[PDB]
Design an enzyme around this catalytic site. Structure first.
Site, short mmCIF file in Angstrom:
data_model
loop_
_atom_site.label_atom_id
_atom_site.label_comp_id
_atom_site.label_asym_id
_atom_site.label_seq_id
_atom_site.Cartn_x
_atom_site.Cartn_y
_atom_site.Cartn_z
N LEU B 18 33.28 -29.21 126.87
CA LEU B 18 33.29 -27.99 126.72
C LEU B 18 33.78 -28.08 128.39
O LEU B 18 34.86 -27.99 129.24
CB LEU B 18 32.77 -26.74 127.10
CG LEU B 18 32.49 -26.01 125.65
CD1 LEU B 18 31.77 -25.00 125.38
CD2 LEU B 18 34.06 -25.60 124.56
N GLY B 19 32.70 -29.60 129.32
CA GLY B 19 33.04 -29.87 130.39
C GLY B 19 32.42 -30.73 130.36
O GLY B 19 31.36 -31.21 129.72
N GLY B 21 30.28 -33.05 134.42
CA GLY B 21 29.98 -33.00 135.71
C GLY B 21 29.22 -34.45 135.87
O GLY B 21 29.12 -35.72 135.52
N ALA B 22 28.78 -34.25 137.04
CA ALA B 22 28.65 -34.99 137.72
C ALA B 22 27.74 -36.06 137.20
O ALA B 22 27.37 -37.51 136.85
CB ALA B 22 27.13 -35.10 138.93
N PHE B 23 25.99 -35.37 136.22
CA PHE B 23 25.47 -36.17 135.36
C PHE B 23 24.94 -35.99 134.06
O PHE B 23 23.54 -35.47 133.92
CB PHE B 23 24.49 -37.12 136.25
N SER B 24 25.99 -34.50 133.93
CA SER B 24 25.60 -33.64 132.85
C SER B 24 27.03 -33.84 131.90
O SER B 24 28.39 -33.45 132.70
CB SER B 24 24.75 -32.02 132.94
OG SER B 24 25.74 -31.68 133.81
N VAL B 26 28.41 -30.22 129.40
CA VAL B 26 29.23 -29.01 128.42
C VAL B 26 29.33 -29.31 127.34
O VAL B 26 30.13 -29.22 127.58
CB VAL B 26 29.47 -28.27 129.84
CG1 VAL B 26 29.00 -26.59 128.84
CG2 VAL B 26 28.40 -27.89 130.77
N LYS B 41 24.32 -27.20 128.11
CA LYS B 41 24.52 -28.04 129.73
C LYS B 41 23.56 -29.23 128.77
O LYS B 41 22.15 -28.52 128.98
CB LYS B 41 24.59 -27.96 130.80
CG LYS B 41 24.47 -28.05 131.73
CD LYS B 41 25.09 -27.55 133.38
CE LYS B 41 25.03 -29.09 134.16
NZ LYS B 41 25.82 -28.15 135.38
N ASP B 133 29.94 -24.80 145.37
CA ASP B 133 31.37 -25.38 144.37
C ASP B 133 31.81 -23.90 144.29
O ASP B 133 32.36 -23.93 142.30
CB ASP B 133 30.47 -26.19 143.23
CG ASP B 133 31.06 -27.32 142.78
OD1 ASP B 133 32.08 -27.29 143.40
OD2 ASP B 133 31.24 -27.32 141.89
#
Ligand code: QI6
Ligand code: QI6
Ligand code: QI6
Ligand code: QI6
Lengths: 265, 265
Positions: B18-19, B21-24, B26, B41, B133
Protein backbone atom coordinates in the site's frame (compact mmCIF):
# COMPACT_ATOMS: atom_id res chain seq x y z
CA UNK A 1 -20.75 18.22 16.89
CA UNK A 2 -23.41 19.11 19.47
CA UNK A 3 -26.84 17.71 18.70
CA UNK A 4 -29.59 20.21 19.50
CA UNK A 5 -32.86 19.25 21.26
CA UNK A 6 -36.06 21.23 22.04
CA UNK A 7 -36.58 18.61 24.83
CA UNK A 8 -34.14 15.86 25.87
CA UNK A 9 -37.10 13.67 26.82
CA UNK A 10 -37.94 13.27 23.11
CA UNK A 11 -34.66 11.28 22.82
CA UNK A 12 -34.15 9.44 26.12
CA UNK A 13 -36.29 7.67 28.68
CA UNK A 14 -34.57 8.48 31.98
CA UNK A 15 -34.43 5.75 34.62
CA UNK A 16 -32.49 5.33 37.89
CA UNK A 17 -30.01 8.00 39.08
CA UNK A 18 -26.49 6.57 38.87
CA UNK A 19 -24.69 9.50 40.51
CA UNK A 20 -25.08 13.07 41.77
CA UNK A 21 -22.39 15.76 41.82
CA UNK A 22 -21.76 19.44 42.62
CA UNK A 23 -24.29 20.78 40.11
CA UNK A 24 -24.97 17.84 37.76
CA UNK A 25 -26.58 14.39 37.91
CA UNK A 26 -25.71 11.22 36.02
CA UNK A 27 -28.80 9.19 35.06
CA UNK A 28 -29.31 5.82 33.33
CA UNK A 29 -31.14 6.36 30.04
CA UNK A 30 -32.64 4.34 27.17
CA UNK A 31 -32.31 5.88 23.71
CA UNK A 32 -35.95 5.73 22.54
CA UNK A 33 -35.05 5.34 18.86
CA UNK A 34 -32.70 2.38 19.43
CA UNK A 35 -33.26 0.85 22.90
CA UNK A 36 -29.51 1.14 23.70
CA UNK A 37 -28.67 2.02 27.33
CA UNK A 38 -26.35 4.93 28.21
CA UNK A 39 -25.18 6.94 31.23
CA UNK A 40 -26.19 10.57 30.73
CA UNK A 41 -24.63 13.44 32.65
CA UNK A 42 -27.04 16.40 32.92
CA UNK A 43 -25.51 19.87 33.38
CA UNK A 44 -27.32 23.23 33.69
CA UNK A 45 -25.57 25.83 31.49
CA UNK A 46 -25.84 28.58 34.11
CA UNK A 47 -23.59 26.48 36.40
CA UNK A 48 -20.80 26.93 33.82
CA UNK A 49 -21.23 30.73 33.53
CA UNK A 50 -17.93 32.33 32.50
CA UNK A 51 -15.76 29.27 31.73
CA UNK A 52 -18.55 27.89 29.51
CA UNK A 53 -16.44 27.89 26.33
CA UNK A 54 -13.39 26.46 28.13
CA UNK A 55 -15.43 23.55 29.54
CA UNK A 56 -17.08 23.16 26.12
CA UNK A 57 -13.53 22.82 24.73
CA UNK A 58 -12.52 20.01 27.06
CA UNK A 59 -15.73 18.46 25.69
CA UNK A 60 -15.30 19.52 22.05
CA UNK A 61 -11.84 17.90 21.92
CA UNK A 62 -12.62 14.84 24.07
CA UNK A 63 -15.66 13.95 21.94
CA UNK A 64 -13.28 12.85 19.19
CA UNK A 65 -11.05 10.68 21.34
CA UNK A 66 -11.66 7.27 22.91
CA UNK A 67 -9.20 6.17 25.60
CA UNK A 68 -9.32 2.50 26.64
CA UNK A 69 -9.46 3.47 30.36
CA UNK A 70 -11.90 6.41 30.23
CA UNK A 71 -15.64 6.14 29.60
CA UNK A 72 -16.26 7.42 26.08
CA UNK A 73 -18.39 10.44 25.22
CA UNK A 74 -20.79 9.04 22.60
CA UNK A 75 -22.76 12.23 22.01
CA UNK A 76 -23.39 15.70 23.41
CA UNK A 77 -26.89 17.18 23.34
CA UNK A 78 -27.64 20.88 23.94
CA UNK A 79 -31.04 22.28 24.96
CA UNK A 80 -31.77 26.00 25.71
CA UNK A 81 -30.35 25.66 29.24
CA UNK A 82 -28.52 22.30 29.59
CA UNK A 83 -25.78 20.10 28.18
CA UNK A 84 -26.17 16.32 28.22
CA UNK A 85 -23.06 14.16 27.99
CA UNK A 86 -24.10 10.75 26.69
CA UNK A 87 -21.63 8.14 27.91
CA UNK A 88 -20.87 4.49 27.30
CA UNK A 89 -22.53 2.61 30.16
CA UNK A 90 -20.24 0.12 31.90
CA UNK A 91 -21.42 -3.15 33.40
CA UNK A 92 -18.58 -4.28 35.67
CA UNK A 93 -19.43 -2.53 38.97
CA UNK A 94 -17.44 -0.66 41.59
CA UNK A 95 -13.75 -1.10 42.41
CA UNK A 96 -13.94 -2.19 46.08
CA UNK A 97 -17.04 -4.36 45.58
CA UNK A 98 -15.06 -6.25 42.97
CA UNK A 99 -12.03 -6.74 45.24
CA UNK A 100 -14.16 -7.86 48.19
CA UNK A 101 -15.97 -10.35 45.92
CA UNK A 102 -12.74 -11.86 44.49
CA UNK A 103 -11.47 -15.12 46.03
CA UNK A 104 -7.90 -14.26 45.07
CA UNK A 105 -6.13 -10.89 44.87
CA UNK A 106 -2.43 -10.09 44.48
CA UNK A 107 -0.06 -7.16 44.13
CA UNK A 108 0.02 -7.96 40.40
CA UNK A 109 -3.75 -7.24 40.33
CA UNK A 110 -3.23 -3.93 42.14
CA UNK A 111 -0.36 -3.07 39.79
CA UNK A 112 -2.51 -3.77 36.72
CA UNK A 113 -5.24 -1.47 38.06
CA UNK A 114 -2.79 1.33 38.79
CA UNK A 115 -1.14 0.90 35.35
CA UNK A 116 -4.48 1.53 33.71
CA UNK A 117 -5.24 4.58 35.89
CA UNK A 118 -1.74 5.94 35.10
CA UNK A 119 -2.43 5.54 31.35
CA UNK A 120 -5.75 7.40 31.58
CA UNK A 121 -4.36 10.22 33.71
CA UNK A 122 -1.26 10.60 31.54
CA UNK A 123 -3.58 11.15 28.59
CA UNK A 124 -5.72 13.68 30.51
CA UNK A 125 -2.56 15.52 31.59
CA UNK A 126 -1.28 15.63 28.00
CA UNK A 127 -4.62 17.21 27.02
CA UNK A 128 -4.17 19.85 29.76
CA UNK A 129 -6.78 18.32 32.10
CA UNK A 130 -6.07 18.02 35.81
CA UNK A 131 -8.62 15.54 37.14
CA UNK A 132 -8.28 16.72 40.76
CA UNK A 133 -10.80 14.13 41.98
CA UNK A 134 -9.24 10.69 41.50
CA UNK A 135 -10.62 8.31 44.11
CA UNK A 136 -12.15 4.78 43.98
CA UNK A 137 -15.71 6.12 43.50
CA UNK A 138 -14.66 7.51 40.11
CA UNK A 139 -13.24 4.13 38.88
CA UNK A 140 -15.58 1.48 37.45
CA UNK A 141 -14.97 -1.88 35.78
CA UNK A 142 -15.90 -2.06 32.11
CA UNK A 143 -17.58 -5.50 32.35
CA UNK A 144 -18.16 -8.54 34.52
CA UNK A 145 -15.35 -10.25 32.56
CA UNK A 146 -12.63 -11.67 34.79
CA UNK A 147 -10.07 -9.68 32.75
CA UNK A 148 -12.09 -6.46 32.70
CA UNK A 149 -10.18 -3.21 32.58
CA UNK A 150 -10.92 -0.32 34.95
CA UNK A 151 -12.09 3.03 33.66
CA UNK A 152 -12.36 6.59 34.92
CA UNK A 153 -16.13 7.03 34.93
CA UNK A 154 -16.53 10.63 35.96
CA UNK A 155 -15.02 14.11 36.16
CA UNK A 156 -15.86 17.13 38.35
CA UNK A 157 -7.25 12.05 52.14
CA UNK A 158 -6.75 11.99 48.37
CA UNK A 159 -5.75 15.66 48.20
CA UNK A 160 -2.10 16.64 47.76
CA UNK A 161 -0.35 18.48 50.68
CA UNK A 162 0.29 21.53 48.47
CA UNK A 163 -3.49 21.88 47.94
CA UNK A 164 -4.04 21.50 51.71
CA UNK A 165 -0.54 23.26 42.49
CA UNK A 166 -0.33 21.43 39.16
CA UNK A 167 -1.07 18.13 37.38
CA UNK A 168 1.12 16.51 40.09
CA UNK A 169 -1.80 16.54 42.54
CA UNK A 170 -3.31 13.69 40.49
CA UNK A 171 -0.16 11.62 40.91
CA UNK A 172 -0.46 11.99 44.71
CA UNK A 173 -4.07 10.74 44.48
CA UNK A 174 -2.95 7.69 42.50
CA UNK A 175 -0.38 6.95 45.21
CA UNK A 176 -3.12 7.02 47.85
CA UNK A 177 -5.27 4.70 45.72
CA UNK A 178 -2.32 2.31 45.35
CA UNK A 179 -1.88 2.36 49.14
CA UNK A 180 -5.53 1.41 49.68
CA UNK A 181 -5.31 -1.30 47.00
CA UNK A 182 -2.46 -3.03 48.86
CA UNK A 183 -3.78 -2.93 52.46
CA UNK A 184 -7.51 -2.07 52.35
CA UNK A 185 -7.41 1.13 54.47
CA UNK A 186 -6.47 4.81 53.92
CA UNK A 187 -2.94 6.05 54.67
CA UNK A 188 -4.28 8.96 56.73
CA UNK A 189 -6.85 8.06 59.42
CA UNK A 190 -9.13 15.30 62.54
CA UNK A 191 -6.68 18.19 63.03
CA UNK A 192 -3.97 15.54 63.53
CA UNK A 193 -5.14 14.02 60.22
CA UNK A 194 -4.87 17.39 58.45
CA UNK A 195 -1.41 17.64 60.07
CA UNK A 196 -0.35 14.17 58.89
CA UNK A 197 -1.33 14.91 55.26
CA UNK A 198 0.46 18.27 55.15
CA UNK A 199 3.67 16.54 56.38
CA UNK A 200 3.11 13.41 54.21
CA UNK A 201 3.37 11.42 57.46
CA UNK A 202 2.19 7.84 56.82
CA UNK A 203 3.50 4.32 57.45
CA UNK A 204 3.49 0.80 56.02
CA UNK A 205 2.34 -0.63 59.35
CA UNK A 206 2.49 -4.29 60.39
CA UNK A 207 0.98 -6.74 60.02
CA UNK A 208 -0.86 -5.46 56.93
CA UNK A 209 2.28 -4.43 54.99
CA UNK A 210 4.53 -7.33 56.00
CA UNK A 211 3.72 -9.45 52.90
CA UNK A 212 4.02 -6.46 50.50
CA UNK A 213 7.12 -6.02 48.33
CA UNK A 214 9.77 -3.33 48.87
CA UNK A 215 9.16 -2.44 45.20
CA UNK A 216 5.47 -1.67 45.91
CA UNK A 217 6.40 0.44 48.97
CA UNK A 218 9.04 2.34 46.96
CA UNK A 219 6.47 2.95 44.20
CA UNK A 220 4.01 4.41 46.70
CA UNK A 221 6.68 6.58 48.40
CA UNK A 222 7.57 8.10 45.03
CA UNK A 223 3.95 9.15 44.38
CA UNK A 224 3.06 10.04 47.97
CA UNK A 225 5.97 12.50 48.00
CA UNK A 226 5.35 15.81 49.73
CA UNK A 227 7.61 17.69 47.31
CA UNK A 228 5.49 17.98 44.09
CA UNK A 229 8.76 18.57 42.17
CA UNK A 230 10.39 15.31 43.31
CA UNK A 231 7.07 13.44 43.08
CA UNK A 232 6.85 10.91 40.25
CA UNK A 233 4.92 11.94 37.21
CA UNK A 234 2.51 9.49 35.63
CA UNK A 235 5.17 8.86 32.97
CA UNK A 236 7.78 8.11 35.68
CA UNK A 237 5.37 5.92 37.68
CA UNK A 238 4.55 3.90 34.54
CA UNK A 239 8.27 3.08 34.04
CA UNK A 240 8.74 1.92 37.65
CA UNK A 241 9.45 -1.87 37.95
CA UNK A 242 6.30 -2.42 40.01
CA UNK A 243 4.24 -1.26 37.00
CA UNK A 244 6.47 -1.97 33.97
CA UNK A 245 8.62 -4.82 35.26
CA UNK A 246 8.07 -7.97 37.26
CA UNK A 247 8.56 -6.91 40.92
CA UNK A 248 4.86 -7.08 41.81
CA UNK A 249 4.31 -10.20 43.92
CA UNK A 250 1.91 -13.09 43.24
CA UNK A 251 0.86 -13.74 46.87
CA UNK A 252 -2.85 -13.90 47.70
CA UNK A 253 -3.43 -10.88 49.96
CA UNK A 254 -7.22 -10.96 49.56
CA UNK A 255 -8.12 -12.09 53.08
CA UNK A 256 -6.49 -9.10 54.80
CA UNK A 257 -7.21 -6.49 52.14
CA UNK A 258 -10.89 -7.41 51.95
CA UNK A 259 -11.19 -7.54 55.76
CA UNK A 260 -9.79 -3.99 55.96
CA UNK A 261 -11.93 -2.65 53.11
CA UNK A 262 -15.06 -4.06 54.77
CA UNK A 263 -14.06 -2.71 58.20
CA UNK A 264 -12.68 0.59 56.99
CA UNK A 265 -15.24 1.72 54.38
CA UNK B 1 0.44 -4.92 25.05
CA UNK B 2 2.76 -6.18 22.30
CA UNK B 3 1.81 -9.56 20.89
CA UNK B 4 4.87 -11.73 20.24
CA UNK B 5 5.31 -13.84 17.08
CA UNK B 6 7.98 -16.41 16.03
CA UNK B 7 6.86 -15.57 12.43
CA UNK B 8 4.39 -12.86 11.37
CA UNK B 9 3.34 -15.03 8.43
CA UNK B 10 1.62 -17.43 10.87
CA UNK B 11 -0.87 -14.57 11.56
CA UNK B 12 -1.25 -12.60 8.31
CA UNK B 13 -1.41 -13.34 4.61
CA UNK B 14 0.35 -10.35 3.04
CA UNK B 15 -1.05 -8.98 -0.22
CA UNK B 16 -0.43 -5.78 -2.22
CA UNK B 17 2.00 -3.10 -0.97
CA UNK B 18 0.00 0.00 0.00
CA UNK B 19 2.97 2.27 0.73
CA UNK B 20 6.75 2.40 1.16
CA UNK B 21 8.71 4.77 3.41
CA UNK B 22 12.21 5.60 4.67
CA UNK B 23 12.84 2.18 6.23
CA UNK B 24 9.37 0.60 6.52
CA UNK B 25 6.63 -0.70 4.21
CA UNK B 26 2.87 -0.69 4.66
CA UNK B 27 1.21 -3.83 3.25
CA UNK B 28 -2.42 -4.98 2.93
CA UNK B 29 -2.95 -8.09 5.04
CA UNK B 30 -5.66 -10.66 5.82
CA UNK B 31 -5.75 -11.94 9.40
CA UNK B 32 -5.72 -15.72 8.77
CA UNK B 33 -7.73 -16.54 11.90
CA UNK B 34 -10.57 -14.11 11.09
CA UNK B 35 -10.41 -13.03 7.42
CA UNK B 36 -10.50 -9.33 8.44
CA UNK B 37 -8.39 -6.98 6.28
CA UNK B 38 -5.84 -4.59 7.82
CA UNK B 39 -3.02 -2.24 6.78
CA UNK B 40 0.21 -3.45 8.39
CA UNK B 41 3.29 -1.27 8.77
CA UNK B 42 6.47 -3.37 8.89
CA UNK B 43 9.49 -1.88 10.70
CA UNK B 44 12.95 -3.45 11.20
CA UNK B 45 14.07 -2.92 14.83
CA UNK B 46 17.65 -2.07 13.85
CA UNK B 47 16.30 1.02 12.01
CA UNK B 48 15.15 2.36 15.41
CA UNK B 49 18.51 1.75 17.16
CA UNK B 50 18.93 4.21 20.03
CA UNK B 51 15.49 5.89 20.17
CA UNK B 52 13.85 2.43 20.19
CA UNK B 53 12.17 2.90 23.59
CA UNK B 54 11.08 6.47 22.76
CA UNK B 55 9.41 5.34 19.51
CA UNK B 56 7.97 2.35 21.39
CA UNK B 57 6.46 4.92 23.79
CA UNK B 58 4.71 6.92 21.10
CA UNK B 59 3.34 3.48 20.18
CA UNK B 60 2.73 2.22 23.73
CA UNK B 61 0.61 5.30 24.54
CA UNK B 62 -1.12 5.63 21.13
CA UNK B 63 -2.23 1.98 21.19
CA UNK B 64 -4.77 2.92 23.87
CA UNK B 65 -6.24 5.92 22.10
CA UNK B 66 -8.53 6.16 19.08
CA UNK B 67 -8.87 9.57 17.45
CA UNK B 68 -11.70 10.02 14.94
CA UNK B 69 -9.29 11.53 12.36
CA UNK B 70 -6.28 9.22 12.76
CA UNK B 71 -6.11 5.59 11.63
CA UNK B 72 -6.29 3.44 14.75
CA UNK B 73 -3.56 1.08 15.91
CA UNK B 74 -5.44 -2.20 16.39
CA UNK B 75 -2.47 -4.30 17.48
CA UNK B 76 1.32 -4.33 17.65
CA UNK B 77 3.24 -7.53 16.93
CA UNK B 78 6.93 -8.02 17.79
CA UNK B 79 9.21 -10.64 16.22
CA UNK B 80 12.97 -11.05 16.98
CA UNK B 81 13.86 -8.20 14.60
CA UNK B 82 10.66 -6.32 13.57
CA UNK B 83 7.63 -4.44 14.83
CA UNK B 84 4.33 -4.68 12.96
CA UNK B 85 1.74 -1.96 13.44
CA UNK B 86 -1.66 -3.38 12.54
CA UNK B 87 -3.93 -0.56 11.42
CA UNK B 88 -7.58 -0.08 10.59
CA UNK B 89 -7.80 -0.24 6.80
CA UNK B 90 -9.73 2.65 5.23
CA UNK B 91 -11.83 2.33 2.10
CA UNK B 92 -12.43 5.91 0.94
CA UNK B 93 -9.37 6.58 -1.25
CA UNK B 94 -6.98 9.48 -1.69
CA UNK B 95 -7.69 13.16 -1.04
CA UNK B 96 -7.14 14.65 -4.52
CA UNK B 97 -8.73 11.71 -6.36
CA UNK B 98 -11.84 12.36 -4.31
CA UNK B 99 -11.90 16.09 -5.10
CA UNK B 100 -11.32 15.53 -8.82
CA UNK B 101 -14.14 12.95 -8.86
CA UNK B 102 -16.66 15.25 -7.08
CA UNK B 103 -19.18 17.14 -9.24
CA UNK B 104 -19.44 19.89 -6.62
CA UNK B 105 -16.82 21.31 -4.24
CA UNK B 106 -16.93 24.43 -2.07
CA UNK B 107 -14.87 26.32 0.49
CA UNK B 108 -17.13 24.76 3.13
CA UNK B 109 -15.84 21.33 1.97
CA UNK B 110 -12.22 22.52 2.21
CA UNK B 111 -12.92 24.02 5.64
CA UNK B 112 -14.43 20.75 6.90
CA UNK B 113 -11.33 18.85 5.74
CA UNK B 114 -8.96 21.30 7.40
CA UNK B 115 -11.04 21.26 10.63
CA UNK B 116 -10.56 17.52 10.85
CA UNK B 117 -6.80 17.74 10.16
CA UNK B 118 -6.53 20.49 12.83
CA UNK B 119 -8.29 18.22 15.35
CA UNK B 120 -5.94 15.29 14.64
CA UNK B 121 -2.80 17.43 14.77
CA UNK B 122 -3.90 19.22 17.93
CA UNK B 123 -4.20 15.82 19.58
CA UNK B 124 -0.76 14.70 18.30
CA UNK B 125 0.76 17.96 19.56
CA UNK B 126 -0.84 17.51 22.98
CA UNK B 127 0.78 14.05 23.11
CA UNK B 128 4.17 15.61 22.28
CA UNK B 129 4.23 14.34 18.67
CA UNK B 130 5.35 16.64 15.87
CA UNK B 131 4.13 15.01 12.66
CA UNK B 132 6.60 16.89 10.44
CA UNK B 133 5.23 15.24 7.29
CA UNK B 134 1.68 16.51 6.78
CA UNK B 135 0.86 16.49 3.08
CA UNK B 136 -2.08 15.15 0.98
CA UNK B 137 -0.43 11.72 0.51
CA UNK B 138 -0.77 11.12 4.25
CA UNK B 139 -4.55 11.92 4.31
CA UNK B 140 -7.09 9.25 3.32
CA UNK B 141 -10.88 9.13 3.40
CA UNK B 142 -12.37 6.68 5.87
CA UNK B 143 -15.05 5.36 3.46
CA UNK B 144 -16.79 5.87 0.14
CA UNK B 145 -19.62 7.57 2.08
CA UNK B 146 -20.47 11.02 0.79
CA UNK B 147 -19.98 12.36 4.34
CA UNK B 148 -16.76 10.45 4.99
CA UNK B 149 -14.24 12.03 7.32
CA UNK B 150 -10.55 12.36 6.41
CA UNK B 151 -7.87 10.65 8.46
CA UNK B 152 -4.12 10.89 8.92
CA UNK B 153 -3.04 7.50 7.57
CA UNK B 154 0.67 7.53 8.19
CA UNK B 155 3.60 8.88 10.20
CA UNK B 156 7.34 9.03 9.45
CA UNK B 157 6.89 22.99 -0.29
CA UNK B 158 5.20 21.77 2.90
CA UNK B 159 8.24 22.50 5.08
CA UNK B 160 8.28 25.55 7.35
CA UNK B 161 10.81 28.37 6.56
CA UNK B 162 12.52 27.89 9.93
CA UNK B 163 13.29 24.26 8.97
CA UNK B 164 14.59 25.46 5.57
CA UNK B 165 11.78 24.44 15.13
CA UNK B 166 8.74 23.19 17.06
CA UNK B 167 5.19 21.81 16.71
CA UNK B 168 4.46 25.02 14.72
CA UNK B 169 6.01 23.50 11.59
CA UNK B 170 2.88 21.30 11.34
CA UNK B 171 0.64 24.35 11.37
CA UNK B 172 2.58 25.77 8.38
CA UNK B 173 2.01 22.46 6.53
CA UNK B 174 -1.72 22.66 7.21
CA UNK B 175 -1.74 26.18 5.77
CA UNK B 176 -0.11 24.90 2.58
CA UNK B 177 -2.67 22.08 2.37
CA UNK B 178 -5.49 24.62 2.80
CA UNK B 179 -3.98 26.70 -0.01
CA UNK B 180 -3.96 23.69 -2.36
CA UNK B 181 -7.51 22.76 -1.34
CA UNK B 182 -8.82 26.18 -2.43
CA UNK B 183 -7.02 26.60 -5.80
CA UNK B 184 -5.62 23.19 -6.85
CA UNK B 185 -1.91 24.15 -7.07
CA UNK B 186 0.99 24.65 -4.61
CA UNK B 187 1.78 28.13 -3.21
CA UNK B 188 5.45 27.78 -4.11
CA UNK B 189 6.21 26.69 -7.70
CA UNK B 190 14.37 25.87 -7.89
CA UNK B 191 16.72 28.21 -6.01
CA UNK B 192 14.06 30.92 -6.47
CA UNK B 193 11.56 28.43 -4.99
CA UNK B 194 13.81 27.81 -1.97
CA UNK B 195 14.07 31.62 -1.74
CA UNK B 196 10.29 32.12 -1.91
CA UNK B 197 9.65 29.62 0.91
CA UNK B 198 12.30 31.09 3.23
CA UNK B 199 10.67 34.55 2.79
CA UNK B 200 7.09 33.16 2.89
CA UNK B 201 6.59 34.88 -0.47
CA UNK B 202 3.33 33.63 -2.04
CA UNK B 203 0.20 35.16 -3.57
CA UNK B 204 -3.53 34.60 -4.00
CA UNK B 205 -3.25 35.09 -7.76
CA UNK B 206 -6.12 35.78 -10.16
CA UNK B 207 -8.20 34.32 -11.57
CA UNK B 208 -7.99 31.27 -9.29
CA UNK B 209 -8.41 33.19 -6.00
CA UNK B 210 -11.00 35.72 -7.18
CA UNK B 211 -14.02 33.67 -5.98
CA UNK B 212 -12.38 32.79 -2.62
CA UNK B 213 -13.42 34.60 0.57
CA UNK B 214 -11.27 37.14 2.42
CA UNK B 215 -11.86 34.94 5.50
CA UNK B 216 -10.23 31.94 3.77
CA UNK B 217 -7.25 34.08 2.65
CA UNK B 218 -6.84 35.50 6.17
CA UNK B 219 -6.96 31.97 7.59
CA UNK B 220 -4.19 30.84 5.25
CA UNK B 221 -2.04 33.93 5.94
CA UNK B 222 -2.22 33.19 9.67
CA UNK B 223 -0.89 29.64 9.18
CA UNK B 224 1.53 30.41 6.35
CA UNK B 225 3.22 32.97 8.61
CA UNK B 226 7.01 33.11 8.45
CA UNK B 227 7.30 34.02 12.14
CA UNK B 228 6.62 30.68 13.97
CA UNK B 229 5.78 32.74 17.10
CA UNK B 230 3.04 34.78 15.40
CA UNK B 231 1.86 31.75 13.40
CA UNK B 232 -1.51 30.35 14.44
CA UNK B 233 -1.49 27.25 16.53
CA UNK B 234 -3.90 24.44 15.71
CA UNK B 235 -6.03 25.66 18.64
CA UNK B 236 -6.06 29.22 17.21
CA UNK B 237 -6.77 28.00 13.66
CA UNK B 238 -9.72 25.92 14.93
CA UNK B 239 -11.32 29.05 16.49
CA UNK B 240 -10.96 31.10 13.27
CA UNK B 241 -14.36 31.96 11.64
CA UNK B 242 -13.45 30.07 8.47
CA UNK B 243 -13.27 26.86 10.54
CA UNK B 244 -15.54 27.53 13.55
CA UNK B 245 -17.95 30.09 12.13
CA UNK B 246 -19.86 30.57 8.92
CA UNK B 247 -17.50 32.60 6.67
CA UNK B 248 -16.63 29.69 4.37
CA UNK B 249 -18.46 30.22 1.08
CA UNK B 250 -20.89 27.83 -0.65
CA UNK B 251 -19.81 28.53 -4.26
CA UNK B 252 -18.94 25.58 -6.50
CA UNK B 253 -15.22 25.99 -7.19
CA UNK B 254 -14.77 22.42 -8.46
CA UNK B 255 -14.19 23.22 -12.14
CA UNK B 256 -11.11 25.36 -11.51
CA UNK B 257 -9.72 23.48 -8.53
CA UNK B 258 -9.97 20.11 -10.28
CA UNK B 259 -8.47 21.55 -13.50
CA UNK B 260 -5.47 22.81 -11.51
CA UNK B 261 -5.04 19.59 -9.51
CA UNK B 262 -5.06 17.57 -12.74
CA UNK B 263 -2.64 19.95 -14.47
CA UNK B 264 -0.42 20.56 -11.47
CA UNK B 265 -0.02 17.09 -9.93
N1 QI6 C 1 -23.04 3.60 37.30
C1 QI6 C 1 -22.34 4.35 36.42
N2 QI6 C 1 -22.18 3.74 35.30
N3 QI6 C 1 -21.52 4.50 34.35
N4 QI6 C 1 -21.34 4.00 33.12
C2 QI6 C 1 -20.70 4.97 32.48
C3 QI6 C 1 -20.47 6.09 33.26
C4 QI6 C 1 -21.01 5.76 34.47
C5 QI6 C 1 -21.21 6.41 35.73
C6 QI6 C 1 -20.75 7.70 35.99
C7 QI6 C 1 -20.99 8.29 37.21
C8 QI6 C 1 -21.69 7.62 38.19
C9 QI6 C 1 -22.14 6.33 37.96
C10 QI6 C 1 -21.90 5.71 36.73
N1 QI6 D 1 -18.72 11.57 33.52
C1 QI6 D 1 -18.10 12.58 32.87
N2 QI6 D 1 -18.37 13.75 33.38
N3 QI6 D 1 -17.81 14.82 32.72
N4 QI6 D 1 -18.01 16.08 33.17
C2 QI6 D 1 -17.33 16.83 32.31
C3 QI6 D 1 -16.70 16.08 31.32
C4 QI6 D 1 -17.03 14.80 31.60
C5 QI6 D 1 -16.75 13.50 31.04
C6 QI6 D 1 -15.99 13.35 29.88
C7 QI6 D 1 -15.68 12.08 29.43
C8 QI6 D 1 -16.12 10.96 30.11
C9 QI6 D 1 -16.91 11.09 31.24
C10 QI6 D 1 -17.25 12.37 31.70
N1 QI6 E 1 -3.91 2.46 1.34
C1 QI6 E 1 -3.73 2.67 2.66
N2 QI6 E 1 -4.76 2.33 3.34
N3 QI6 E 1 -4.58 2.49 4.70
N4 QI6 E 1 -5.57 2.11 5.54
C2 QI6 E 1 -5.07 2.37 6.75
C3 QI6 E 1 -3.79 2.90 6.71
C4 QI6 E 1 -3.50 2.97 5.38
C5 QI6 E 1 -2.36 3.33 4.58
C6 QI6 E 1 -1.19 3.82 5.14
C7 QI6 E 1 -0.11 4.14 4.33
C8 QI6 E 1 -0.19 3.96 2.97
C9 QI6 E 1 -1.36 3.49 2.39
C10 QI6 E 1 -2.46 3.18 3.19
N1 QI6 F 1 0.91 4.45 9.65
C1 QI6 F 1 1.43 4.70 10.87
N2 QI6 F 1 2.74 4.65 10.89
N3 QI6 F 1 3.33 4.83 12.12
N4 QI6 F 1 4.67 4.83 12.23
C2 QI6 F 1 4.87 5.03 13.53
C3 QI6 F 1 3.68 5.17 14.25
C4 QI6 F 1 2.71 5.03 13.31
C5 QI6 F 1 1.27 5.06 13.30
C6 QI6 F 1 0.53 5.24 14.46
C7 QI6 F 1 -0.86 5.34 14.39
C8 QI6 F 1 -1.50 5.27 13.17
C9 QI6 F 1 -0.78 5.07 12.00
C10 QI6 F 1 0.61 4.93 12.06
Amino acid sequence: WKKQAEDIKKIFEFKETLGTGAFSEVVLAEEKATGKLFAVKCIPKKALKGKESSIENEIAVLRKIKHENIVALEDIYESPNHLYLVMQLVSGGELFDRIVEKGFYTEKDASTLIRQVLDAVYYLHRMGIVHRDLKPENLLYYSQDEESKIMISDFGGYVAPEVLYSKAVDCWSIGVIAYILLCGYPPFYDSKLFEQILKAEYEFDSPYWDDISDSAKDFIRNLMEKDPNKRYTCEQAARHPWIAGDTALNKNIHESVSAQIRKNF
